[PDB]
Every structure is written in structure tokens, then in C-alpha cells.
């Protein structure tokens, strides 16, 4: 039957979760985190609005190749860190591993910059996203992850309903970032729980997959929905489900 | 005379003053304030100037929702500290207390964003406004509040007169910020006094009621007036009278 | 003959200098300065680029009254320090002195802002300008001042010449800030020499007045010249003239 | 015959390299560097991206002369450091030397600002370029220079190819900065080798002349090329041969 269309996307879910664990391991090799305080999520969001405010003021100060530059900087660094925990844990601190990541990251970013085959893009998106998922997963525990997840899920539902209101009223009464970004979102808990086949939060993984099933059903009808809340709600569901076992 | 129209505003005056005294109470529970020096107003002038400068560059980074984002943030934090101290007085440091604040705050801001009954707003404004009123009122003593108040009174009469003259000459010779904001102002002295039935600065409360009496009379006639000076001039009046008594 | 018109500039020269010495006095009551280092002039120029970049990004982030607001702050600070040293020297350490200053500065700025008679302006300009003049005069010694004056006389002469050429080429081959400001300029050497009727660098004052004799001679003619260099040149002249006595 | 045209560029290569070396010797006299670590390139890249971001936020904040200002700043400081170290070696810290630098730098930037003869500019450009060349060159050793240079050549090739494609697709399918800057590029490695007639990495210099040979050939044919890669590739070539030598 109809498999391939728009179903490699949850495949990217399972994947990013996976790659986030397999990256959980090599990642403690360089410190990271940041304390399982619940103020930690707030630090997150403060710095996130900061990050966005920054990205936007780059754009409005763009930037003929300079935008493409700055984001190249950010890239090459981030890839250097991926391959960093990867190789530099694997082959260890050796000269070989360090060249391995340097050359590794130069290679990759230069590829993605040179017009790939752009299903490639789905993969590097998977890599990176898993990366981020796993670090903020190693930064602190569920209880905060839970607060953050409920938090963002309600923000999404709020703004979605809001612009929707702007749509109904307007009569008479590149997106990939937000994508893989909110793909990471509820899998920070799939990591920060295993970081707390595997754990009982295989349940969180599948509960999250079901959250996506729900979403991808709601949206594939005319007039869309929130987005996060089915995902965070569902991942929190499947996870707190992974609690009856242990 | 006439009641409910534009007398719910002084309703909001006595209110926010009241709520600001009742908030005098729980607030020392997390410290706050701030030194009874008069050097506070000019640094204050500094920091409000910074804050407005900030709010504005937020706007210029709009930001279809990023505006609403950052300001929603600032708002919700402030609500969480409201319900926070609320909790740390009632149940005190308990886990339950902190959650009480979460749910409280979520309730409040998520409500306020989802288009309520918007007599709600005058109220939420009363809440927040009472928040700031009560803090800076708990922040240090009368005399500084007094000077700061004279200072601001002169800035308003200045700018208002400035632009008014600018209208008469030009022939040939969102507002709730400044609003509930100016509703807050003379309640700090009402607070910073009970902080210094209650204080003899119940008189400042009634004096504030006389300031609004004057303002809401004159402004309610064609061709407006200064604004602040009737309010602070009058509240400081009633206050220093309530100093002349006891 | 024609004396009084457009000869008030050297008059305010003599004036701003005089008031600058009378202001040399009260100022140590609150410190200021900043070591006679030859690196300090650059601290100055950097921080002026700071002040201007600030001033410009304020303007283009303007600013309904917010411009007039912010410059109201900066102004009022400056006035409170003027009357601060004035009174706190005059009335001495007393509380009374401090009030002398608030009452003073509020009075003054409220005035200048409420459409005075704006011959006021030349005087407040004399005050303020003299103030800044003496503060930085108290910041460090001659030798650095000498170099600094040469430098600014050159920025003036270069940019003047540059845009002049841009005028000869362009055919076929608020100013009050730079005013009272560059009026302050050559009098910082008249102060920091008074620290190295009175001193023998009265000569720098009249010699500088003669630099202006040159200047105000040229201005009233078609096709200008530099500006600073006749003044700083003339003041350094009068100063190294004032070297033979002491 | 065709001498002076587009063959003065390799002469300026040899020159900037030479002046970078003859200045290499005296330069360790005030510290410099920044540890032959490879984290140096990545932080660096950060700092150039930052510096440009800053320079730009100047530019759109022009600033009729404020632009010209800040860049005048950078200029005269840097010339004062050139003639600065120049003097602090010879007569040493004495007044004669430091005055020599000031006056020197005065001469130079004041000249270079007043519309020169602009073969002058190739010369002062050679000066400055040799300066920066020798500093980051004395800043630490090769292997980092190796990594950094590989990085820069690849980014250059990336953006050139990118916008080239961007040119072929739009059918139907002030410049001296990047100049003397990447003229410096392969001469830091020519320097970080004397900091490591002369060395056997005199070869890197002719390898660089071969890189420029290649480049001034390709580009001087209709439809240009990358730029860095011939230069860095070739200088690294001649250099690594001078490693096979010893």
C-alpha cells in the first residue's frame, strides 16, 4: 500500500531518537549539560529567545554571503562537535580522531552547502537534531523536561489558535528548522529518561510516535491544528506510560 | 452623579492600592525591594529607559509572534512570581506551593491570550499593576518615592504641554501600558508608607482618589490636561496632610 | 559700529572658560577625572564614538518623546552634577545642598524644556559646556591634552577639506552640539594647565580667543576653512606662550 | 612590454611577504600571538565574523562621517602600532621614539586620507598587510595555520561556486579589502615558519607566487575562478616541498 510518501518523516522520528541515544554515550566525553533544577528550562527559553533575536538581527543586517557565512561558522562548529563526541570517543583523544572530526565536519558542511540530493538534508537534519536532542537530554532530568514540554506545547497551541483567529477574521466575523526543531522537542525526554531493547521509555518513544500519528492525521485534513500538543502530550503520555513497568 | 462608566477606573485605583497592601504582606518572603536612599529614582529612570528601549527594539524585530512571544514571556514570568510569593506565604516553600504558582500562572496567561471576557483584563491589569506597585512600594521608603514622583509629574506636564502647544501652533502661530502603569504609580507611595486600619497613608489612598477625581473630571471634558500632576500632586497632598495629622 | 552682533561667540568663550574655572573648584567634592597617561586621550575618543553611536542609534530608534526623554535623562544627570558640585561646595556636605541641586536641576531642565526665551540656551550652554570642560580638564594633564587637541583639530580639518573637495567636484571637475562642544574643546587645555589674575596660561585663554579672532573672521566670509585648528592651534599657542613665566 | 599591469600584483605578493618577515624579526617585543593550538582558528573565525558584523552595524548606522570615523580609528591606531613598534625597537621607550611613531602615523593616515596617488595605496596597503601578516604569523605555529588555510580556501571556493551557479540560473536553468587581505593569507604561513639565505620555507613564498600565477591567469581569462584555493594550495605546495628538503 501507500508507504513511502510522507512516512519517512516518523522514520526520522525513530531515527533521531536512536541517534540521540547512541550519541548520549560519546557525549558525556566532553562535559555538557546546563543541575536538575526547574529554573534550568527557563534558562533554556531565555537563551532561545536570545538566539532567535540574534538570528533575526543577522538577517536584517544580512549579509550577501555573510548570512551564509555566519551560519557556516555555526555549522562547522556543530559538526565538529558531532564527530567530536563520535570519533573522539571512539578512536579516543588520538591525533587520528581529531583529524577525523576536523576533516569530517569540513567534508559534511561543504557537501550540504554544495547542493546535495536534499533527501540528504533529511539525514543531516536527523543527525544534528539527534545531536541537540541528546545534549539537552543530558542537561537535566525529566521533571524539568516535563515542565518545558508542557510549556512549549501550550505556546504552540496558543499561537496556532491565534493566527487562526487572524485567518477567520480576515473575512468577516526553510520551515525545516521549526520542523526538526520540534522533532527534537519531545525526544529530549526520550533521552532525559534513558539518561535518567532498552529503558521503559521505549514507551516514551512509541507514545511519541503515536503523538505524531495523531498529528499527521489532524493536519492531513483541511484547516490544521496545534502541532506540539499532540507530540508533547503524546510523548509525555507514552513516557508516563513507561512508568507502570518501572 | 454618573456611576459605572469611567468610575470603574477609580474602582481600579482603590483596588490596585488595596491589592498592593495585601501584597505588601507576602512579598518580603522572597526578599525583593531596593537602602532608603533618594539615589534610587535616577537609576530607576535609567532602567525604565532601558526597558522601553528594549521593548521597542523587540517590536522592530517583529516578528509576527516574536513580539507577542517576548512580551508574553515577561508577562508570564511576572505572573509566576505573583503566584510564587502567593504560595510562599500560604503553603510556604512546599512543592505544592510552587505548582500552585505554575497552574495559577498557566491558567491566567493562557486564559488572557485565548480571548476571554476582557472585563478580565482590567482585573489582570489590577493584579500585575498591584504587583509592581507593591514591589517598589516595598522597595525603599517614602521620601525617595516622593522625589521620583515630583520628577515624573514634571516630565509628563512637560511632554503633554509640549505636544499640545505643538498642536495649537500647527495651524499658523496598547495604551494600557501608560494607563494601568499610571494606575500603579501613586500606589507605591501608598505602599511605601504602610511599608514605612493601616498606615496614616490611607490618606494617600484617598488623596489618590482626589487626584483621579480631578483628572477624570477635566479629561472628561473636551480638550484634555496634563495627567500625572493632578494625580501625584494630589496624592502627595493627601499624604502630607495625613502626615500633618499623625 | 557693528560690535555686539556675532561677537558673542568669543564672549561666551571668555564666559564658558570663566564659569569653567569657577566650576573647577566645586567639582573635587565628587571626584571625577580618568593618571596623566598618554593613553587616556584615546579612552576619550573611543567613548565619544560610543556616545555618538549611541546617540545615532537612539535617534534612528526614535522615539515619540523617547528621544526627548533620553536626552532629558542625560541632561538632568548633567545638571544635577553641576548644581551638585555647586551646592555641595557651597552649602557643603549638607542635606540642604543636595536639595539645592534637585530644586536647581528640575527647575532648569523643566525650564529649557517648556519653551523658555532660549537666549537662556546660550547661558545653559555656557554652564554645561563649562562643566564638561572642567571635568575633563580634571581628567588628566597637559602633554596628553596637547596631543589630543592636535588630533581633533585634524579630524575637523580633514573632514572639512574632504567634503569641500566633494563640493568642488560635485559640479564638473542641532549644530549647536558641535558648537558648544568644540567650544569646550580648546578650553580643556586652558584647565589642565591651570593644574600644571591667576595662572600664566591666561595667555592660552586670550591666545585661544585670538584663534577664534581668526575663526570668526573667516566664518563671516564665503568658502570656509577647518575650524578647530585655528582654535586648538591658537590655544596651544597661548599656552606655550604661557610657558615663559612658570 | 606588458610589465606594470597585473604583474605588479605578484610583486606586491613578494613585497608584502618580505615586509612581513623583515617585520617578523622585531615583533615578539610586546607579546602577541593567540599557543600553537588548533582551537585558535575556530575562535578566530568567530572573531572576524564578529568584527565584520560590527563594522556593518556601523555602516547602516552611518553616520555621514561616523563611518569614516570608526574606520579612521582603526587606521590610525594600527599605524601608531606599526610606527610604534618601529620606534620602540630603535631608540627604545624614549620620548624621541614614541613621538616618532605618533608623528609617523600622523603623516601616514592623514596622507592616506587626503586622496593620495593610489600607487601609494598599493604601498601602504603593502605596509598594513605585511603588519597583520606578521602578527597572526607570529601568533602560533603552522598546523593551526594549515587547518585555518584549508578552511578559508574551501569557504572561498564554496561561495564563488555558489554565486556563480546563482548567476547561470538567473537566465533560465572599496574592493581592496578582500584584496590586500587575501594577499596576506598565504604570507602568514610564509611568516609562521620564521617564527617556527634563510629557511627552507622560503619555498612557500615562490609556491605562493605560483598560486598567484595560476590565479592571475585564470581570472584574466573570461569567466573567473575561486581565488584562495590556487593561492593557499600553491603556497602550501611549495612549503611542503621545503619540508621534503629538510
DSSP D133-182: HHHHHHSS-HHHHHHHHHHHHHHHHHHHHHHHHHHHHTTT---HHHHHHH
Report cis status (omega within 30 of 0) of the bond before B111. Answer: no
C-alpha of A29 from chain center: 21
Q: How distant, in Å, are the alpha carbons of A179, B158, B161, C114, C205 from that of B167?
A: 52, 14, 10, 15, 46
CA A153 to chain centre: 14
Chain A partners of B102 at a C-beta cutoff of 8 Å?
A: 147
Give the Cβ contact number of residue A70 at 10 Å: 22
* Rounded Cα gap, residues B26 and B138, in angstroms: 11
How far apart are alpha carbons A206 and A59 in whole angstroms?
38
Sign of CA dihedral B65, B68, B74, B79: negative
Flag if D110 and C154 touch (Cβ within 8 Å).
Answer: yes
- Among A56, A67, A69, A95, the strongest candidate for a mutation testing the D interface, having the largest count of D CBs within 10 A, is A69
Cβ separation D53–A76 shorter than 8 A: no
A163 in contact with B at a CB cutoff of 8 Å? yes
- Cα first-last separation, chain C: 39
- Sign of the torsion formed by the C-alpha atoms of D43, D49, D50 and D51: positive
Secondary structure letter of residue D30 according to DSSP: G
Question: For residue B175, what are the CA distances in angstroms to B16, B178, C208, C233?
Answer: 18, 6, 54, 55
Distance CA C241, CA C229 (A): 17
Contacts of C135 (CB under 8 A, 6+ apart): C27, C32, C33
> Of A44, A232, A227, nearest to A132 (Cα)?
A44
From CA D143, how far away is CA C19, in angstroms rounded? 63
In angstroms, what separates the C-alpha of D66 from chain C's closest C-alpha? 8
Cβ atoms of residues D187 and D135 within 8 Å:
no
Please tell me the distance from the alpha carbon of residue B113 to that of residue B103, in angstroms, as a whole number: 15
Alpha-carbon distances, residue D145 vs A84, A152, D10, D59, D155 (angstroms): 20, 44, 22, 31, 15
* C-alpha grid cell, residue D27: 615583533
Q: Residue D19's CB: how many other CB atoms inside 10 A?
A: 19
| D107 contact partners, CB below 8 Å, separation of at least 6 | none
Whole-number Cα distances in Å, A123 to A3, A118, A186: 19, 9, 19
B227: alpha, beta or left, given left = phi > 0 and alpha = psi -120 to 50?
left
Burial (CB count within 10 angstroms: exposed 0-12, middle 13-18, buried 19+), residue C230 = buried
Q: Are C101 and C88 in contact (CB under 8 A)?
A: yes
Extract the C-alpha cell encoding C135. Answer: 571635568
Domain extents in chain B: 1-246
One-character DSSP codes across D70-88: HHHHHHHHHHHHHHHHHHH
CA separation for the pair C212, C210 (Å, rounded)? 5
Q: How far apart are alpha carbons C114 and C124 in whole angstroms?
A: 14
Q: Are D120 and D3 in contact (CB under 8 A)?
A: no
CA torsion sign, B178 to B179 to B181 to B184? positive
| Residues of chain B neighbouring A165 (CB-CB closer than 8 A) | 115
Could you say which DSSP state residue A141 is in?
Answer: -
Query: In Å, what resolution does this model reach?
Result: 3.8
Nearest Cβ partner for D113 among C46, C52, C158: C158
Burial label for B244, CB within 10 Å (0-12, 13-18, 19+), is exposed
Cα angle value C191/C197/C202 (rounded, 5°): 40
Give me the helices (H) in C170-201, please: 176-184, 187-191
Chains in contact with A via at least 3 Cβ–Cβ pairs below 8 Å = B, D
Interior angle at CA B33, CA B30 and CA B38, nearest 5: 165
Peptide bond into A42 cis (omega under 30): no
Using DSSP's 3-state secondary structure scheme, residue B65 falls into coil
Chain D nearest-CA residue for C156: D65
Set of cell numbers at residue D199? 629557511
CB of B188 within 8 A of CB of B133?
A: yes
Residue (of D214, D129, D219) closest to D180 by Cα position: D129
In angstroms, the CA C46 to CA C61 distance is: 22
Q: How far apart are CA B172 and CA D152, in angstroms?
A: 64
Cβ within 8 Å of residue C173, ≥6 positions away: none
- For residues C196 and C141, is the Cβ–Cβ distance under 8 A? yes
Distance CA D45, CA A105 (A): 15
| Cα angle value C222/C224/C227 (rounded, 5°) | 145
Cβ-defined contact of C158 to D110 (cutoff 8 Å): yes
The backbone torsions φ and ψ at residue C80, rounded to the nearest 5 degrees and listed phi first, read: -65, -30
Residues of C within 8 A of B147 (CB-CB) are 102
Q: Which H or E run contains B235?
A: helix B228-245
What span, in angstroms and rounded, lies between the C-alpha atoms of A36 and C159?
A: 59
Q: How many CB atoms lie within 10 A of CB D161?
A: 15
CA distance B149 to B16: 18
Cα Dmax for chain D: 68
Angle between helices B142-169 and C95-113 (to 10 degrees): 20
Name the 3-class secondary structure at C172.
Answer: coil
Instruction: Please tell me if residue A59 touches chain D, with a CB cutoff of 8 Å.
Output: no
Helix (H, G, I), strand (E, B) or coil at D1: coil
CB proximity D1 to A under 8 Å: no
Q: Say how far apart CA D130 and CA D122 lie, in whole Å.
A: 12
What are the angstrom distances between the C-alpha of C212 and each of A160, C207, C243, D7? 68, 9, 21, 52
- Report the neighbours of C using a cutoff of 3 or more CB pairs below 8 angstroms: B, D
Residue bearing cell 550540504:
A112
- Whether the CB-CB separation of C78 and C129 falls below 8 Å is answered with no
**Chains with ≥3 Cβ pairs under 8 A against B?**
A, C
Nearest CA among B153, B162, B23 for reference residue B85: B23
What distance in Å separates the CA atoms of residue B164 and residue B224, rounded to the nearest whole number? Answer: 9
The three three-digit cell numbers of residue A168, written as one number = 477567520
Angle, vertex CA B165, rays to CA B161 and CA B166, nearest 5: 115
Contacts with A74 from chain D: Cβ below 8 Å: none
C-alpha cell at C87: 551646592
CA distance A70 to chain D (A): 7
| Sole residue written with cell 512516512 | A7
φ/ψ of residue A181, rounded to 5: -65, -55
* Residues D30 and D85: beta-carbon distance below 8 Å: yes
What is the Cβ-side half-sphere exposure of residue A181, based on CA atoms within 13 angstroms?
12
Asked if A52 lies within 8 A of B66 by C-beta distance, the reply is yes
**Beta carbons of A26 and A93 less than 8 angstroms apart:** no
Closest approach of B64 to chain A, Cα-based (Å): 9
3-class secondary structure, D188:
helix
The angle subtended at Cα C163 by Cα C157 and Cα C164, nearest 5°, is 80
Cβ atoms C241, C201 nearer than 8 A:
no
Under DSSP, is residue A136 helix (H, G, I), strand (E, B) or coil? helix
Q: Which residues of A touch B64 (CB under 8 A)?
A: 163
Smallest CA-to-CA distance from A152 within A37, A56, A44 is with A44
- Helix D8-22, helix D120-138: angle, nearest 10: 40
The residue to which cell 573648584 is assigned: C25
Distances, alpha carbon A74 to alpha carbons A68, B243, D45, D202, in Å: 10, 63, 10, 36
Which residues precede a break in chain A, with C-to-N distance above 2.5 Å?
A: 34, 173, 196
Going from the C-alpha of C142 to that of each of C15, C47, C148, C198, the distances in angstroms are 22, 20, 10, 17
Half-sphere exposure of D109 (CA within 13 A, CB side): 25
Amino acid at each position: 500500500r501507500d508507504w513511502l510518501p510522507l512516512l519517512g518523516m516518523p522514520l526520522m522520528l525513530l531515527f533521531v531518537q536512536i541517534i540521540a541515544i547512541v550519541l548520549v554515550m560519546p557525549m558525556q566525553a566532553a562535559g555538557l549539560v546546563a543541575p536538575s533544577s526547574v529554573a534550568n528550562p527557563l534558562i533554556f527559553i531565555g537563551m532561545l529567545l536570545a538566539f532567535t533575536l540574534v538570528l533575526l538581527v543577522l538577517l536584517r543586517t544580512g549579509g550577501r554571503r555573510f548570512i551564509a557565512a555566519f551560519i557556516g561558522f555555526a555549522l562547522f562548529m556543530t559538526f565538529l562537535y558531532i564527530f567530536g563526541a563520535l570519533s573522539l570517543l571512539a578512536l579516543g583523544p588520538t591525533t587520528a580522531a581529531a583529524a577525523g572530526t576536523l576533516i569530517g565536519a569540513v567534508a559534511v558542511t561543504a557537501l550540504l552547502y554544495l547542493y546535495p540530493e536534499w533527501y540528504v538534508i533529511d539525514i543531516l537534519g536527523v543527525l544534528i537534531s539527534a545531536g541537540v536532542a541528546s545534549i539537552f537530554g543530558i542537561s537535566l532530568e525529566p521533571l524539568p523536561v516535563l515542565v518545558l514540554l508542557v510549556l512549549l506545547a501550550v505556546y504552540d497551541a496558543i499561537s496556532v489558535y491565534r493566527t487562526k483567529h487572524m485567518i477567520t477574521l480576515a473575512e468577516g466575523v526553510g520551515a525545516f528548522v521549526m520542523g526538526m526543531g520540534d522533532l527534537i522537542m519531545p525526544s529530549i525526554l526520550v533521552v532525559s529518561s534513558h539518561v535518567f531493547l532498552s529503558a521503559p521509555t521505549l514507551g516514551a518513544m512509541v507514545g511519541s510516535l503515536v503523538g505524531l500519528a495523531v498529528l499527521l492525521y489532524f493536519v492531513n485534513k483541511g484547516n490544521p491544528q496545534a502541532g506540539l500538543p499532540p507530540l508533547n502530550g503524546g510523548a509525555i503520555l507514552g513516557f508516563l506510560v513507561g512508568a507502570a513497568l518501572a
